[PDB]
């Protein structure tokens, strides 16, 4: 019944459904009632599937970028560097990144 009646992932609860929705309703109610002292809920496994579309680009774009200054001036008290960072055409970044190296 592993490969024939069901797909293997759904049979082994790798990607099929959550425990609360593939267990019997009576068993779910019993597990909820006796969770305080007997804790049935450990024995059953949830799929925890990751999204597979509209999350990442796969269009050959970089994660880290090294920007060199367009010009630099340095008095003997301060070192000023000027950068122009181009934010792609569609990507966005939060300035929590972009540390000065």
């Amino acid at each position: 019944a592993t490969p024939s009646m069901l797909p293997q992932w759904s049979y082994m609860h790798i990607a099929g459904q959550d425990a609360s929705e593939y267990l019997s309703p009576g068993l779910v109610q019993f597990a909820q009632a006796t969770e305080s002292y007997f804790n049935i809920g450990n024995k059953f496994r949830n799929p925890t599937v990751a999204p597979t579309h509209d999350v990442t680009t796969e269009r050959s774009q970089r994660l880290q970028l090294r920007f060199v200054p367009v010009d630099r001036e340095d008095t003997q008290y301060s070192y000023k560097t000027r950068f122009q960072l181009a934010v792609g055409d569609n990507r966005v970044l939060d300035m929590a990144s972009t540390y000065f190296d």
């Binding site: 797909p7 992932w9 990607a15 099929g16 459904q17 929705e21 593939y22 019997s24």
Partner: protein, 178 residues
């Protein structure tokens, strides 16, 4: 040939229960270069009969749909397994046993003689939701039969039969790269 083409045999993907693309049936094919016109005509007739049988079987046992292969299927379309009734023979009343124990009696072993009443339970232990998802092998072999493609890649690229290439996302039509 465009009149009697070799059928496209589907590949089963047992992990996620979907068709993993289709390819020409190159494994079961006759060799007629050593044959004359008569035997070649017989082979062509047999191939045509094979294609007709495949189309008939598809039209008979294939569930109608607007997509060649949907990765996820509706709950009612998937053949759910039937499970029989479960009978719970309750062995002992608890209130009367508590009464006997409170009155100073020890009960060991184990129907019971002291309790006259007998109660039984019966229910269907069905899943909470009817397991919507992928296909199984048995319910796949009866729906993804070898599909013959009469005029190969004739017509608009819109109407090109996709889902034959293994690395093709069904929804948001695009080829899945590395």
């Amino acid at each position: 040939s465009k009149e009697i083409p070799t059928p496209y045999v589907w590949t089963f993907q047992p992990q996620m229960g979907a068709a993993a693309g289709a390819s020409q049936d190159y494994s079961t094919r006759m060799n007629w270069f050593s044959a004359g016109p008569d035997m070649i005509h017989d082979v062509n007739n047999i191939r045509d009969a094979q294609n007709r049988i495949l189309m008939t079987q598809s039209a008979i046992t294939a569930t109608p749909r607007n997509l060649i292969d949907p990765r996820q299927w509706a709950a009612h379309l998937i053949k759910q397994p039937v499970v029989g009734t479960t009978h719970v023979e309750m062995p002992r009343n608890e209130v009367l046993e508590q009464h006997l124990t409170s009155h100073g009696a020890q009960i060991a072993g184990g129907r019971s003689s002291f309790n006259p009443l007998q109660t039984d339970f019966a229910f269907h232990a069905l899943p909470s939701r009817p397991r919507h998802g992928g296909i199984g092998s048995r319910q796949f072999v009866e729906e993804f039969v070898p599909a013959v493609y009469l005029n190969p890649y004739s017509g608009p690229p819109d109407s090109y039969p996709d889902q034959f290439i293994r690395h093709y996302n069904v929804y948001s039509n695009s080829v899945s790269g590395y």
